[PDB]
From Swiss-Prot:
GO terms for biological process: cell migration; heparan sulfate proteoglycan catabolic process; myelin assembly; negative regulation of fibroblast growth factor receptor signaling pathway; positive regulation of skeletal muscle cell differentiation; regulation of protein localization to membrane; Schwann cell differentiation. It is found in: Cell membrane; Endosome. The chain holds residues 29 to 474 of 558 of the full protein. One of its GO terms (cellular component) is cytosol. It is a lipid-anchor; GPI-anchor. Disulfide bonds join C4-C40, C34-C201, C41-C204, C191-C224, C213-C299, C217-C293. Belongs to the glypican family. The keyword Signal applies. This is Glypican-1. Keywords: Cell membrane, Copper, Disulfide bond, Endosome, Glycoprotein, GPI-anchor, Heparan sulfate, Lipoprotein, Membrane, Proteoglycan, S-nitrosylation, Secreted, Signal, Zinc. It comes from the Eukaryota. Changing N88Q: No effect on protein yield. Protein yield reduced by 90%, abolishes N-glycosylation but no effect on secondary structure. Glycans are attached at N51, N88. GO terms for molecular function: copper ion binding; fibroblast growth factor binding; laminin binding.
């Protein structure tokens, strides 16, 4: 008892200097973060351990962000490349059948057809948002190069198909960007305090083998990630809209059939997998506290070993007003996070609009 051996062992395994560690327990009068009591930690050790815990939590968060980003990027690239390939192969089928099938009108107008397809690619890329004018001019210089009353319907169908595809890809890209920018938001100093007291203060108070209580760590991380948790609602909204817009991919007027029919398996599986991934990460913004506590981090409640009494806080900034472990100013939001929320709102609007109308 009262020996600093084990704490010295752990503090040494951290790579830190072994000169700064006391032989036995000293007075904890000097401890700023950890509750003051007989301890094996000097102020030096306290600061060092604090820095360590903070850097570790940072690393975990950044890792989660990297995983999510990678997934969304993969989905994005997949759907984008496929949507490109459908049209490109519609053009290859075109060039294969059409000249061999019928008259010199085609072979003379071939560059005009190529320009039509290229303009459709520009429409899909979002470089040109009005296809009515470009189509009307296509028919104008096709007429002046001479295609019945129909297919004016192909205009409408291509419109509603291509806007759906573009909206889905844009959605994936936007989610990816939101995650990207939010990931660079730094942790608060009070959050760093609470985290230190969550992790290494157990070591400092003489219980180095003690495990942090689940509700305790939970409240701490809900205190730290409170701003990130505000993204929940709009995130779910965007994901819901992205799940919705894939319904337009199917049917004779469906996106697939339309992008394939411009001359007149796969995407289904991709859409299924996408649905799986999105329904997996719908919980993302509020899931972090529960995830990091259950994996990377009878029990240590922050004072001593024992039960953790306080009940777990709700998700979001405002619900942290009474947070026992960390002190949150709910009057100050993170403006970056709020901006990203706005972005989510915008893209969600675009997707809803794309779903039910013009
Ligand atoms: C579609 O055709 C264009 C013509 O330049 C080509 O560059 C592109 O590789 C094709 N689609 C894709 C993205 O593979």
């Amino acid at each position: 008892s009262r020996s600093c051996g084990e704490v010295r062992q752990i503090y040494g395994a951290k790579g830190f200097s072994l000169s700064d560690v006391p032989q036995a327990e000293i007075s904890g009068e000097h401890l700023r973060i950890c509750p003051q009591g007989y301890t094996c930690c000097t102020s030096e050790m306290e600061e060092n351990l604090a820095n360590r815990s903070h850097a570790e939590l940072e690393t975990a968060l950044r890792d989660s962000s990297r995983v999510l980003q990678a997934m969304l990027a993969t989905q994005l690239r997949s759907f984008d490349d496929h949507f490109q390939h459908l049209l490109n192969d519609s053009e290859r089928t075109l060039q294969a059948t059409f000249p061999g099938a019928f008259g010199e009108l085609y072979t003379q107008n071939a560059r005009a057809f190529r320009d039509l397809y290229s303009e459709l690619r520009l429409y899909y890329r979002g470089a040109n948002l009005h296809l009515e004018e470009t189509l009307a001019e296509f028919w104008a210089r096709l007429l002046e190069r001479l295609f019945g009353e129909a297919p004016r319907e192909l205009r409408l169908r291509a419109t509603r198909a291509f806007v759906a595809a573009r909206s889905f890809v844009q959605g994936l890209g936007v989610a990816s960007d939101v995650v990207r920018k939010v990931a660079q938001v730094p942790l608060g100093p009070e959050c760093s305090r609470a985290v230190m007291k969550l992790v290494y203060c157990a070591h400092c108070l003489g219980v180095p083998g003690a495990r942090p209580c689940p509700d305790y760590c939970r409240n701490v991380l809900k205190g730290c990630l409170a701003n990130q948790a505000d993204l929940d609602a709009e995130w779910r909204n965007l994901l819901d809209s992205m799940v919705l817009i894939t319904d337009k991919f199917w049917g004779t007027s469906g996106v697939e059939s339309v992008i394939g029919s411009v001359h007149t398996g796969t995407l289904e599986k991709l859409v299924s997998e996408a649905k799986a991934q999105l329904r997996d990460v719908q919980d993302f913004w509020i899931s972090l506290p529960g995830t990091l506590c259950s994996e990377k981090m009878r029990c240590w409640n922050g004072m001593a070993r024992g039960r953790y009494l306080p009940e777990v806080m709700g998700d979001g900034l405002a619900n942290q007003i009474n947070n026992p472990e960390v002190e949150v100013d709910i009057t100050k939001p993170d403006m970056t996070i709020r901006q990203q929320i706005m972005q989510l709102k915008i893209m969600t609007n675009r997707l809803r609009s794309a779903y039910n109308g013009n």
